[PDB]
Each structure stands twice: as structure tokens, then as C-alpha cells.
Design a protein around this nucleic acid. Structure first.
Ligand SMILES: [Mg+2]
Ligand SMILES: [Mg+2]
Ligand SMILES: [Mg+2]
Ligand SMILES: [Mg+2]
Ligand SMILES: [Mg+2]
Ligand SMILES: [Mg+2]
Ligand SMILES: [Mg+2]
Ligand SMILES: [Mg+2]
Ligand SMILES: [Mg+2]
Ligand SMILES: [Mg+2]
Ligand SMILES: [Mg+2]
Ligand SMILES: [Mg+2]
Ligand SMILES: [Mg+2]
Ligand SMILES: [Mg+2]
Ligand SMILES: [Mg+2]
Ligand SMILES: [Mg+2]
Ligand SMILES: [Mg+2]
Ligand SMILES: [Mg+2]
Ligand SMILES: [Mg+2]
Ligand SMILES: [Mg+2]
Ligand SMILES: [Zn+2]
Lengths: 102, 69, 91, 50
RNA sequence: CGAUCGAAAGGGAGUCGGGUUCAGAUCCCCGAAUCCGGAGUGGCGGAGAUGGGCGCCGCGAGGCGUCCAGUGCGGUAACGCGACCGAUCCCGGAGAAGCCGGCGGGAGCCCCGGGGAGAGUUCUCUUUUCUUUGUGAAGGGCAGGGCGCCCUGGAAUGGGUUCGCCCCGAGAGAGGGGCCCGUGCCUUGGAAAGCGUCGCGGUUCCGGCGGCGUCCGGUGAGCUCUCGCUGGCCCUUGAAAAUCCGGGGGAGAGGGUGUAAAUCUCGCGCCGGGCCGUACCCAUAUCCGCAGCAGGUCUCCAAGGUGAACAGCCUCUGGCAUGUUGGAACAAUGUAGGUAAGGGAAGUCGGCAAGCCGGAUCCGUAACUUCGGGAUAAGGAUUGGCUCUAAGGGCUG
RNA sequence: AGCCGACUUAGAACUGGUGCGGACCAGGGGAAUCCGACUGUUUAAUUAAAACAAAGCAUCGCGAAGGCCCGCGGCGGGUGUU
């Protein structure tokens, strides 16, 4: 049973405060599989990048909120924690929206 | 509450004099028919979407129907 | 193993009440808590309930007996005297 | 207590109604000597008997 | 067997879930129930009950006429089935029973491994840390627990069996059943409601409308509550009545074969439940002590770690502002804490006060004795952290 | 043979400035004398004791119109549901 998840950061890319590419290489160096982070844990986790939408698939047990944890790690790395917010619109998906002040 | 196993006794309980209302609940893998009598709320449980629709026409005309959502 | 050398039931009383009083109450506290044989069902389940009351666990038979023993020698001799006087009166 | 009887609650009702100040218009009267209500009662100070 | 009174902790039929207020909720609203009382016409259905023989007819399927029976039925049994007449009278049961120990079951809480949802950290690391993740009463079904219940059969080379016990020719084991409680699970209730999260409305006065989710497992001498089994103690034997039920009896009642009757603790249907209390405090400020007085005053609930622990210490939920004031100084004498070279009771009426010792493991333990004790006698040794090894169990075939 | 889980006990090595029940919790001990057996109770607000009680021991009265006692009084009442 394949597990497919999406990460669509449309709004920060169209605002220009963050680019999806540097996020995608951060993912491809930073997902750990079975305790091993480098080299993607073999050919079990595949990452496609669309226009501000990164799709990931895996046939091993892969937690969805691990992607949320790594994305919040990316926002803290690029100081976007007080600006952007990672939520789930529908299941198997994540959204980068903004905080709703004013 | 009372559960009616068959369809034939459901028609008698809906055709009772004290049947105040009948209400149809449409959820997943189940259709529920509830007749509010004086003492009990009689529930008929149907797991056949074809028989649910024919029974919905087969309700008596003197009874007040409230299709729930 | 053998726990105590000379005290039995009265070892629960510790180092109190006097050795001779403990030696006196030892016989009563053995015979009071021993389970006697039943004269009705034959089982050894005749146990004291209160003073004068001895109940059998199997037969559900309760007998008026002594305070600390099932039978008293002051009443067995009375039982014998009453049966000999009963035979004497009717001849 | 909350487990009152009817006569005790009625007595408390009357002693609640007597614990109001005097109306303002009574000391504009001709034969008047009353300055205020001297029969007043506070729940903390005077404990009403009972 | 004595009128009558006598318990807002004894006995005592029957209500729970959601929502709602500035202040009331098992009481208001909505939705689900339930107890008691009432009934001529008894409102309906069902039960009582509609069976057999004979004589004809009908090819038969069956149909008229006579003579009867019929206050239910099944199981070897424990007993079961939706009812299943019966009074004065009698018998019995429930209400209706102490304290303690041990063990087992079921909940709630805690614990571990994952999936979601939302948050916290991210200087480095952390598939990481925190929160949350469900179903009422009543009915039906099934687990589970208990039985001092029944049937077969007859046991020593005695067996069965507990933690301990204990049981057996007055019938054990071994098979097959029966009953009780089922507060546990599933279902009706019931997803429509509730909660989490995201987003739209009403510019707002909204039980507003929607999208998803509310998941899968494992464990325990754990703590609390409850149910059950078994044992110990008493020169202590641990309430009554209101009220309710079952049985034994058989005075009676009902109908002559049917639009059957008397009757019914069965399923529904109809009406009603009057009177009083209900807010708040319940205590270092709503009570009593003359007061917002360090005093007194009866109970319920009872998280994580450390640890034997409801001990002490720290923390989470919840709560509060230091107990009828603040600022600045740091004198004596105080009050409450400590620490002191060398000596070790020389102080003092008096080792008063303070100090020493202390948990656990390993050994070791005297005089005397009422043989139970003395006894943690006295006396010493060890204790951290880290990395390992060995031993102590279930499930399936 | 495979799959699972709960806390313990013992032993060994290494290691720290001999420190380790590191806070907390947490008995000083022995030889004797007097008195009271002990557990318990007592002068609320100066005395917690050797005082009181206690089991044990020993006397006394009484067989019910009775012993002991209450009551102004009754065919009164308690012990005595003895
Ligand atoms: Mg006061
Ligand atoms: Mg009364
Ligand atoms: Mg009462
Ligand atoms: Mg047997
Ligand atoms: Mg919902
Ligand atoms: Mg009879
Ligand atoms: Mg209240
Ligand atoms: Mg104060
Ligand atoms: Mg202070
Ligand atoms: Mg202050
Ligand atoms: Mg010194
Ligand atoms: Mg020194
Ligand atoms: Mg001196
Ligand atoms: Mg001197
Ligand atoms: Mg001292
Ligand atoms: Mg000594
Ligand atoms: Mg001497
Ligand atoms: Mg003494
Ligand atoms: Mg005093
Ligand atoms: Mg004193
Ligand atoms: Zn017997």
C-alpha cells in the first residue's frame, strides 16, 4: 500500500518570501529512513516537485506529521515560523498559509 | 428505543394510531426508519439501498414524514 | 519446622497475661477451635459457632453443647443417669 | 441552611423586607422626628437569633 | 399488642444525555425513558380455545347434525416458554445486617507502542515534546464471573484442587446440561447531538452553515471503586417496621360447543401525580469564638516523578498573591536557624538544650526470661555512575 | 521451532579528587536501682504519674412476698427480655 502526500506552498512562492526548490533539496537531504538520513534510505521514498507543490511517495510506513515536523524545521531555519503556518486542508496534503491578523 | 428486525411489523407500527411522525436518516452503509410512537421510537435498519427507496414510497399516506439530514 | 517449643495457640499472646494463665487458657483455646466429628453425618465438620452452639458444615446440624468442648463430662453422666432413670421408672 | 422549612423561610422573608432604608419623602412631613432607620440589621453583625 | 410522635447519614418504587443564564438546572428547552394510581362501556390485540368420536354428504380437498372434553404447554432433571382463574386462612422469603485477612473478575485512572489533528523547540540534535482522540438511562443479544444446582457413572496403586484451604460411596474426577449476576462488549438510543481542527457566512441579534477526524493495539504484587469466593475472631454474634412477593390449601366463579364465558402478573393504547425546600459560603473573609481572630467545626474525588508509601521534595489540571500596609537602612538586645580550632559535661539541681545514630543488603547478636521474648540487642562490612552476563514466563503448532 | 512482555535478584569488568541511603525520609547505645505487670484512663486552662482502671485472687448478701437500690405517692419503678 503506497503512501502519497503533498506539500503545496503556493502562497509564499507567489509572495516571493520562500522558494520551493531549496525546500525540496532540504527534504531530499533531511528525511531519515530507518535511522539513516543520507541517500534517501534507498529507492523507497520518491520526491516529485511541481509548481510550488512537492509530492512524496513511500511504500514503507511513513508518518504524515513527520513531513510537518520537517517543514516547521525549514520555516525555523529560514525564519518563517512567525509568518507562515503549515496546516492540513484535506488529508494526505499540507498547506502553507499565513497568520490571520488584520 | 425498540429495534424492528423485519419490514412487515414496521408497517403496522407506522400504521398505528399513536404514530406521531416518521423520520428517515440517510447515513453510510445503512438506512434508518424511525417511527415516533407514544411509548417507543421504533427503528427499522435496512442495509439494502433498493428496498429503502421502495419502502419510502410504501409508507402510509396519513403519516407525517421528516426526511432528516 | 517446629516453630515454638512449649507454647501453642497462646503464642499469639506474646509475653503477656502470665505463664500459668496462658497454660490454663491453652486447653480451652485448643478444644474451642478444634473441629469435631459429627454424630449425624460422620464428617469432621462440627465447629463452634458461639458458646453452647456447635454447627456441622455438611449436615447443617447445630447442637447445644458445652462452652469450650462439644461434650461435657458433667452432662454425659447426666445423659447416662437419665436413661437409667427412664428405664427404672418404666421398669 | 438550604434545607429550610416554610415558617423559617417566611420569617426570613419578613426580616429581609424590613431591612430597607426609609423613603426620602417622609422627613418633609410636618410632625416628623425620624432622621433614618435605626432598626436596621446587617447579616455579619447582628445574627437575628434563631 | 397498643392512640400518636421519633432519622434532609438507617429502611424506602421510579431520570438520564445534550443545550441554555449576568446569576437556576438529574428542576428550564430538546431528545430518549421509567414508577405508581385509575377505569362501568372495560380501548385493541393475544391467552383462556376452539379438539375428538359417531352418523351422513363431498371423488377428495373437506362440509352440516348429535355425543362429549377442554382453569395452557415443553424438558429424565436442574427448570424453561409472552400470559396461564381462585377468597377467608396458614407457611415462608425479601427488606434484614458485625469486624479483619487473603485471592479472583469488571470498570475508572495511570503506563508502553504506533496512526491522525493542532501546538512547543529547532544556535546543534531530536520520524522529537505537549494536548486531544467518545457514548447515557431503558430494552435485546453475547462475552465474563459465580453456583452448598441437575443427568450418566462408580473411585485405593486414592484422586481432584487452592495462595492458604478444602471436597468425595450422604457420590470425587471425567463428559453433558441448568440457573443467577452480567455496572463489560455489540446494537436500538446514535450521530441528527458532543468534542478536536480548518473554512465560509449573518457588517451583527445566530443550539448558523459546511470539509475532515473522533483510529489500531499491549500490559501491569500498579492506585481507587465495585462484584464474587474463601478463611479467621468473639464469655462481643453484630436492629426493627413500613412495604412487596412466592407457596400450601380449594370455599367459589364461569360456558354448554359458541358473535363461547369467567379470568390474565402478556404486548400495546388513554388520563393524572397535589404540598414544602432548591440561589450562595461551607472556611487562614459568608458558621461559632465581641472581629475578615494562626483556635474550633461532619463528609465525597484524589494525576506524573522519586520512593516501601495517602511520608518528605519538585511538577501538570485547577487556584492564589504572601495572609489588617509599603519604602530605606542592616546598631544593640531579641525570635527563629546554622557553623566553630583544641579539649570533651570541667557547665548545671540535673547532659536542659543541642549534638551522635538512622534507610536498605550481608553476616553477627549477650545477660536474663513467664521460653513467647530481649532484638533494629550490642558489633562491623557494603551502597554512585556506566558497560555487560546469568537466572526467574506466556501464545501457537 | 517461531512470536511476544513484565519487573526483579545475583555476579563481573571499567570508572570518578573514597564520593555514593550525596537533597528528602530516617532508632544513639550499654550496665544497674526504685515503682507500676502489661495495652488503656485521668485533674478541658500549672500536676500524665508510682495515681485510677485492668485480668487474676478472695470474701459478703440473696431461691423472688428475695438481695441491692430509686421514688411525694400508687396492684409504682431499675437490675429484670434476669
Ligand atoms: Mg460571625
Ligand atoms: Mg413519622
Ligand atoms: Mg430518611
Ligand atoms: Mg463432580
Ligand atoms: Mg459529527
Ligand atoms: Mg393450587
Ligand atoms: Mg446549588
Ligand atoms: Mg485573614
Ligand atoms: Mg512573607
Ligand atoms: Mg502584600
Ligand atoms: Mg568545637
Ligand atoms: Mg573538631
Ligand atoms: Mg559536675
Ligand atoms: Mg560547678
Ligand atoms: Mg534532650
Ligand atoms: Mg537490653
Ligand atoms: Mg533491692
Ligand atoms: Mg503503669
Ligand atoms: Mg492541666
Ligand atoms: Mg501537662
Ligand atoms: Zn453433620
Amino acid at each position: 500500500q503506497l503512501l502519497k502526500f503533498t506539500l503545496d506552498c503556493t502562497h509564499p512562492v507567489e509572495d516571493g518570501i520562500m522558494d520551493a526548490a531549496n525546500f525540496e533539496q532540504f527534504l531530499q537531504e533531511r528525511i531519515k529512513v530507518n535511522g539513516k538520513a543520507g541517500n534517501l534510505g534507498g529507492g523507497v521514498v520518491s520526491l516529485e516537485r511541481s509548481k510550488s507543490k512537492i509530492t512524496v511517495t513511500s511504500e514503507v510506513p511513513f508518518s504524515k506529521r513527520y513531513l510537518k515536523y520537517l517543514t516547521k524545521k525549514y520555516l525555523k531555519k529560514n525564519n518563517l515560523r512567525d509568518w507562515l503556518r503549515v496546516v492540513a486542508n484535506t488529508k494526505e496534503s499540507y498547506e502553507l498559509r499565513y497568520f490571520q491578523i488584520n | 428505543p425498540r429495534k424492528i428486525e423485519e419490514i412487515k411489523d414496521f408497517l403496522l407500527t407506522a400504521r398505528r394510531k399513536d404514530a406521531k411522525s416518521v423520520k428517515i436518516k440517510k447515513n453510510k452503509d445503512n438506512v434508518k426508519f424511525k417511527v415516533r410512537c407514544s411509548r417507543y421510537l421504533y427503528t427499522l435498519v435496512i442495509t439494502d439501498k433498493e428496498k429503502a427507496e421502495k419502502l419510502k414510497q410504501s409508507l402510509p399516506p396519513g403519516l407525517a414524514v421528516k426526511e432528516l439530514k | 519446622a517446629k516453630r515454638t517449643k512449649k507454647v501453642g495457640i497462646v503464642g499469639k499472646y506474646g509475653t503477656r497475661y502470665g505463664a500459668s494463665l496462658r497454660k490454663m487458657v491453652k486447653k480451652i483455646e485448643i478444644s474451642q477451635h478444634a473441629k469435631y466429628t459429627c454424630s449425624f453425618c460422620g464428617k469432621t465438620k462440627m465447629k463452634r459457632r458461639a458458646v453452647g452452639i456447635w454447627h456441622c458444615g455438611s449436615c447443617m446440624k447445630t447442637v447445644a453443647g458445652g462452652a469450650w468442648t462439644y461434650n461435657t463430662t458433667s452432662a454425659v453422666t447426666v445423659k447416662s443417669a437419665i436413661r437409667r432413670l427412664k428405664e427404672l421408672k418404666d421398669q | 441552611s438550604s434545607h429550610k422549612t416554610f415558617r423559617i423561610k417566611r420569617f426570613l422573608a419578613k426580616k429581609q423586607k424590613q431591612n430597607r432604608p426609609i423613603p426620602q419623602w417622609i422627613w418633609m412631613k410636618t410632625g416628623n422626628k425620624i432622621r433614618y432607620n435605626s432598626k436596621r440589621r446587617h447579616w455579619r453583625r447582628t445574627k437575628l437569633g434563631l
